Amino acid sequence: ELTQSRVQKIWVPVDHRPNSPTVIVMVGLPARGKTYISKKLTRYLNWIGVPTKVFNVGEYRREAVKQYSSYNFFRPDNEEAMKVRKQCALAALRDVKSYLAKEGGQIAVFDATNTTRERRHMILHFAKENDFKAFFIESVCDDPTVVASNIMEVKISSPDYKDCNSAEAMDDFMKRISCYEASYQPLDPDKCDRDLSLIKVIDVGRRFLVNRVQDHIQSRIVYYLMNIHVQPRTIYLCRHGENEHNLQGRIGGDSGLSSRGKKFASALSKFVEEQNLKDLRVWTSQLKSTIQTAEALRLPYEQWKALNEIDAGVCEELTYEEIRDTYPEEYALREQDKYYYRYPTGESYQDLVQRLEPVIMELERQENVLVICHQAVLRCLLAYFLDKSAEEMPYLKCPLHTVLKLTPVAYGCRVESIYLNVESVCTHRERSENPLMRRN
Amino acid sequence: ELTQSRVQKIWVPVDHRPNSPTVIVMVGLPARGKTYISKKLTRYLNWIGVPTKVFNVGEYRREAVKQYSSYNFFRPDNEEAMKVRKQCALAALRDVKSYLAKEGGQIAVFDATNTTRERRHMILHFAKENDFKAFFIESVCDDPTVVASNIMEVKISSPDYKDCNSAEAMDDFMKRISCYEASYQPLDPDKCDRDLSLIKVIDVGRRFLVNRVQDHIQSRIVYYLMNIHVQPRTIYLCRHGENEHNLQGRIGGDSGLSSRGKKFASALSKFVEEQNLKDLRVWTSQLKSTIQTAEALRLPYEQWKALNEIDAGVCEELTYEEIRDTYPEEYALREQDKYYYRYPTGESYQDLVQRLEPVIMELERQENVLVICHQAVLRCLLAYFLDKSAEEMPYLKCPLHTVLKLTPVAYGCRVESIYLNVESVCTHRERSENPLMRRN
Ligand SMILES: Nc1ncnc2c1ncn2[C@@H]1O[C@H](COP(=O)(O)OP(=O)(O)O)[C@@H](O)[C@H]1O
Ligand SMILES: Nc1ncnc2c1ncn2[C@@H]1O[C@H](COP(=O)(O)OP(=O)(O)O)[C@@H](O)[C@H]1O
Ligand SMILES: O=P(O)(O)OC[C@H]1O[C@@](CO)(OP(=O)(O)O)[C@@H](O)[C@@H]1O
Ligand SMILES: O=P(O)(O)OC[C@H]1O[C@@](CO)(OP(=O)(O)O)[C@@H](O)[C@@H]1O
Ligand SMILES: O=P(O)(O)OC[C@H]1O[C@](O)(CO)[C@@H](O)[C@@H]1O
Ligand SMILES: O=P(O)(O)OC[C@H]1O[C@](O)(CO)[C@@H](O)[C@@H]1O
């Protein structure tokens, strides 16, 4: 007969009491970007609501072996270490099983060189017997400058190399790489790996070989992998300059900038100029206050409906007081479950994620971008860049008049905050703190 | 200082008076799906708002050569026909130039075998000198059953074979294919075509080789190409059973089914059963009336916010009369420009396109799907399947209680309409038909 759920506003059938998880398998020599792709891809998947976890076999190794000493550990003749490495893989797999079949996880990224047919064949056997789909991602790169640079960026400052300097860490890791070169069997989609679902990423994403995509979530991953790059650049995020409803503690609406909001706009101009960016895309919402802010910059800017602020449904243009008083039950429900709560005839943070994915996907393709937007929206994008969970995302602090400047480092993003020194109200609201439903 | 445009509600700077177009190049032997990919890809691009046109060199040929007689026309020794074919290509290119540089077009799909380096090299020269990006799409398929089947489906009933039967049309076309086999040079991304942007579609999309995507619109095309298939299936589209606001001529809202809407639901059940589909996905919106309708079917169904009806902003739940009276100017603006018009704090048909693209993209991946939805939404999806322009889309007829059953045939979709014989109101509104602003 159907009832409308109170938080999400989803119609469900009144309950009057009387698909397959995926193991993603990274493949390739060390320092080929496997961990980087693993973390980044996991970041994306979790943010769009597909629960995903990285199993880095190296971290299992570091847990079972106290202190690393040298590449001798990795030699093919090292029978004891081969026993430990195998056991490390199997222990990681056990966890994958646990995570896909008992913990709610949907994708497990199995992050190891997985460079032999023998190793892949085993992983397949394990997928098969657990009823997991398997998908392979191989990074192929024999440009020595790339390999070298990669080693400098992430390898030499690993815990393996703690009591150790650059030149010898670098030298050791080059020998660890040679250990794997002898029996490395790349994916052969053309005959032997004919039936595997895989993508082979070649020359830092200059080229792809894609073979048998088998489902919604695989085709997404491929799309994503083909749009990210590693060129250096900067993402700036901030809100529209202070607006008039800000001044009255009113949510939503389409009000213009306060005189302070305008002073922020000029400062943002000054800030942009001093950053000395050769090019810079500017994006705004379609709400006036982000566009007026962009106008202060005298640069081409592009408006996106998707960046419009969360839609507060029938609460548009009310104060939170007015909300508490007219809709106390709604007000309380939003406080209980702020990520999933949807306003009546309006949206939840969950909805924002879904409209923002194409913004994120274009952010990934671009180089320098300034995105001028709104509180909830900004939280949602920041959660993606800083890997914040659904549960922390509605509460991230995203004040007015402040640029978040995001630069890629190692495996994620450095955030620097830069306030442009123009006052405004503060619209941040922290989380909020029953005897008579019990006998005592 | 900024003013809000009256139709689209876009903030633009008050005007107080004082990138590169793409040529897509199809590559491959005849009957490899080139025209099919060309038309389908064009259909997609236009619907998402990227203006795109197919230039089929064969149609130029049919215009310059009166009546086709046989494959002798295509022989490599046929010097006169080689002059005509070349001139046909160049004339198509002239049109491409005209379309990209003078007509507003953004993508031109150059649809010919384009099987030699010499031919591609020329096309490149032409792109270069006109400042067009160039992107190549090659279909490789040497499965004789596929080639044969393809010839049966689209070739034998071409105007070339008018006074001609199956067996000899088929025989002639196999020889036309052999004409091209001798100097066919496939794209070699591995050395000679190292610098071309291309995708090589292999074995009906079992496998892809992608090389140097260079922009937003290229990566989209690839994503799209990797999600379409050619397996036989059926798409059903219909509206929620009649609802209560329907009965009062009220737009929007979230009202439940009338007793007739419920009788439709049962009939839809009966209809689904008699279709005898081995599997069938069912999708609804998150509005009650589509979900109640799906409940009548007793099948798993999945709710999509993106399928929710167009949002009429501050007109939600008004009658069109109430709209005319309270917002005559809005009412008139919507009549002037119904595709682009956006309701205040609500949406336009343009917005629906953009929320619906992921629905379309998943429709392309699926097999049997029934989508139960709403008037404007249904128009938008139908426009994509039946290739209708922006301008005709807001006016397509999508009555209550009627299934549109879409089956792939040749180069697009057959539509059959099936009414389930339960009365309802009719919510269709046709298009609507100044001396005092002039001296006489
Ligand atoms: N497709 C790629 N090919 C080569 N290097 C890459 C790729 N993607 C990212 N990288 C680089 O790899 C480095 C991280 O290496 P890591 O992911 O730890 O390698 P691995 O896990 O293969 O040992 C980063 O410097 C990043 O720029
Ligand atoms: N990737 C593909 N490989 C082979 N055949 C395909 C592919 N995609 C579509 N087809 C089939 O091609 C047929 C249409 O052929 P057409 O597009 O006119 O070929 P061409 O233009 O290469 O002569 C349809 O039957 C369709 O099923
Ligand atoms: O199981 P194999 O194929 O050895 O790969 C796991 C090993 O890969 C290594 C090799 O570098 O990766 P990582 O850089 O991920 O720490 C080892 O640390 C880890 O023990
Ligand atoms: O310029 P080329 O490479 O000959 O390709 C154009 C020719 O391709 C053909 C070969 O079949 O395609 P179509 O099937 O598109 O009509 C000819 O009709 C057309 O004249
Ligand atoms: O989810 P929160 O914390 O209530 O913040 C969202 C609000 O912030 C604003 O951008 C300005 O306060 C409102 O328009 C929006 O409703
Ligand atoms: O664009 P149109 O022709 O006004 O039709 C859209 C309307 O149709 C309905 O689905 C029902 O009439 C309304 O909810 C919606 O506003």
Q: Are B210 and A208 a contacting pair, CB within 8 Å?
A: yes
**Which residue on chain A is closest to B311 by alpha carbon?**
A345
A314 part of contact set with chain B, CB < 8 Å: no
Structure-block tokens of residue B301: 């169904």
Structure-block tokens of residue B404: 């549109």
* CA distances in angstroms from A395 to A235, A389, B29, B316, listed in the order given: 21, 11, 58, 31
Enter the resolution in angstroms. Answer: 2.5
Q: Which residues, at least 6 apart from B292, have a Cβ–Cβ distance to it below 8 Å?
A: A2, A11, B240, B241, B256, B257, B261, B262, B265
Beta-carbon separation of A288 and B10 below 8 A: no
Q: Which residues, at least 6 apart from A118, have a Cβ–Cβ distance to it below 8 Å?
A: none
- CA B409, B30, B406 angle in degrees (round to 5)? 10
Ligand nearest the Cα atom of residue A226: 1
Alpha helices in B2-133 (DSSP H): 34-47, 57-64, 79-102, 117-130
A34 secondary structure, DSSP code: H
- Give the separation between CA A108 and CA A92, rounded to whole angstroms: 10
Helix (H, G, I), strand (E, B) or coil at B202: strand
Q: Is the dihedral angle over the CA atoms B23, B28, B31, B37 positive or is it negative?
A: negative
Q: Are A202 and A208 a contacting pair, CB within 8 Å?
A: yes
CB-CB: which of B10, B208, B355 is closest to A210?
B208
Beta-carbon separation of A11 and B291 below 8 A: yes
B350 part of contact set with chain A, CB < 8 Å: no
Nearest to A91 by CA among A128, A60, A129: A60
Q: Are B265 and B288 a contacting pair, CB within 8 Å?
A: no
CA distance A263 to chain B (A): 15
CA distance B213 to chain A (A): 8
Nearest to A352 by CA among A50, A52, A28, A48: A48
Structure-block tokens of residue B68: 């086709």
Q: What is the dihedral of CA A336, A342, A347, A348, to 10 degrees?
A: 40
* CA distances in angstroms from A357 to A106, A288, A362, B355, listed in the order given: 19, 22, 9, 12
Name chain A contacts of B307, Cβ cutoff 8 Å: none
Nearest to A136 by CA among A57, A232, A38, A49: A38
B5 part of contact set with chain A, CB < 8 Å: no
Structure-block tokens of residue A121: 């064949």
Nearest to A296 by CA among A269, A258, A334, A336: A269
Q: Which residues, at least 6 apart from B128, have a Cβ–Cβ distance to it below 8 Å?
A: none
Structure-block tokens of residue B388: 């209708």
The amino acid present at A379, given as its one-letter code, is R
A14 part of contact set with chain B, CB < 8 Å: no
Atom 2, ligand 5: which residue's CA is nearest? A376
Of the CA atoms within 13 Å of residue A168, those in its CB half-sphere come to 8
Fold of A231-433: Rossmann fold (3.40.50)
CA distance A5 to chain B (A): 12
CB-CB: which of A11, A211, A295 is closest to B207?
A211
Angle between helices A34-47 and A375-385 (to 10 degrees): 150
- CA A42, B197, A362 angle in degrees (round to 5)? 40
Experimental method: X-ray
Structure-block tokens of residue B382: 């139908």
The number of beta carbons lying within 10 Å of the beta carbon of residue B15 is 6
Structure-block tokens of residue B360: 């379309």
- Give the separation between CA A422 and CA A264, rounded to whole angstroms: 6
Helix (H, G, I), strand (E, B) or coil at B405: strand
Measure CA B24 to chain center: 17
Q: Which residues, at least 6 apart from B318, have a Cβ–Cβ distance to it below 8 Å?
A: B250, B251, B312, B326
Q: Are B394 and B407 a contacting pair, CB within 8 Å?
A: no
- CA A39, A41, A47 angle in degrees (round to 5)? 100
Q: Where in chain A is the domain with CATH 3.40.50.300?
A: 20-230
- Give the separation between CA A305 and CA A303, rounded to whole angstroms: 7
SS (H, E, C) chain B: CCEECCCCCCEECCCCCCCCCEEEEEECCCCCCHHHHHHHHHHHHHHCCCCEEEEEHHHHHHHHCCCCCCHHHHCCCCHHHHHHHHHHHHHHHHHHHHHHHHCCCCEEEEECCCCCHHHHHHHHHHHHHHCCEEEEEEEECCCHHHHHHHHHHHHCCCHHHCCCCHHHHHHHHHHHHHHHHCCCCCCCCCCCCCCCCEEEEEHHHCEEEEECCCCHHHHHHHHHHCCCCCCCCCEEEEECCCEHHHHCCECCCCCCECHHHHHHHHHHHHHHHHHCCCCCEEEECCCHHHHHHHHCCCCCEEECHHHCCCCCHHHCCCEHHHHHHHCHHHHHHHHHCCCCCCCCCCCCHHHHHHHHHHHHHHHHHCCCEEEEECHHHHHHHHHHHCCCCCCCHHHCCCCCCEEEEEEEECCEEEEEEEECCCCCCCCCCCCCCCHHHCCC
Q: Is B85 annotated as a binding residue?
A: yes
Q: How close is the Cα of A59 to the center of ligand 1, in Å?
A: 17
Nearest to B137 by CA among B196, B83, B198, B95: B198
Its CATH architecture, for the domain B20-230, is 3-Layer(aba) Sandwich (3.40)
Q: Are B303 and B284 a contacting pair, CB within 8 Å?
A: yes
Name chain A contacts of B224, Cβ cutoff 8 Å: none
Ligand nearest the Cα atom of residue B35: 2
Nearest to B35 by CA among B193, B151, B198: B151
How do B107-111 and B22-27 pair as beta strands?
parallel
Name chain A contacts of B303, Cβ cutoff 8 Å: 10-11
At residue B376, φ and ψ (nearest 5 deg) are -65, -45
Angle between helices A34-47 and A349-365 (to 10 degrees): 150
* CA distances in angstroms from B158 to A45, A121, B59, B82, B348, listed in the order given: 47, 49, 11, 21, 40
- Give the separation between CA A341 and CA A327, rounded to whole angstroms: 14
Q: Where in chain A is the domain with CATH 3.40.50.1240?
A: 231-433
* CA distances in angstroms from A51 to A41, A56, A99, A131, listed in the order given: 11, 17, 10, 17
Q: Which residues, at least 6 apart from A348, have a Cβ–Cβ distance to it below 8 Å?
A: A8, A310, A339, A340, A341, A342
Q: Is the dihedral angle over the CA atoms B148, B152, B154, B159 positive or is it negative?
A: positive
Atom 11, ligand 5: which residue's CA is nearest? A251
Q: Is the dihedral angle over the CA atoms A149, A154, A160, A162 positive or is it negative?
A: positive
Nearest to B35 by CA among B154, B185, B195: B154
Structure-block tokens of residue B295: 């409940």
DSSP string, A200-219: EEEGGGTEEEEE---SHHHH
Structure-block tokens of residue B203: 């074995």
CA distance A241 to chain B (A): 15
Q: Are A393 and A380 a contacting pair, CB within 8 Å?
A: yes
Residue B107's H or E segment, with its range, is strand B107-111
Name chain B contacts of A10, Cβ cutoff 8 Å: 286, 303
C-beta of B176 in contact with ligand 2 (< 6 A) = no
Measure CA A5 to chain center: 29
C-beta of B26 in contact with ligand 4 (< 6 A) = no
Structure-block tokens of residue B48: 């998402």
Residue A282's H or E segment, with its range, is strand A281-284
Q: Are B240 and B159 a contacting pair, CB within 8 Å?
A: no
- Per DSSP, what are the bridge partners of residue B281? B369
Q: Is the dihedral angle over the CA atoms A144, A146, A151, A153 positive or is it negative?
A: positive
CB-CB: which of B11, B210, B256 is closest to A226?
B210
The amino acid present at A179, given as its one-letter code, is C
Alpha helices in B212-287 (DSSP H): 216-225, 244-247, 259-275
- Per DSSP, what are the bridge partners of residue A25? A110, A136
- CA B115, B45, A304 angle in degrees (round to 5)? 135
- Give the separation between CA A246 and CA A257, rounded to whole angstroms: 9
- Give the separation between CA B355 and CA B358, rounded to whole angstroms: 7
The number of beta carbons lying within 10 Å of the beta carbon of residue A335 is 14
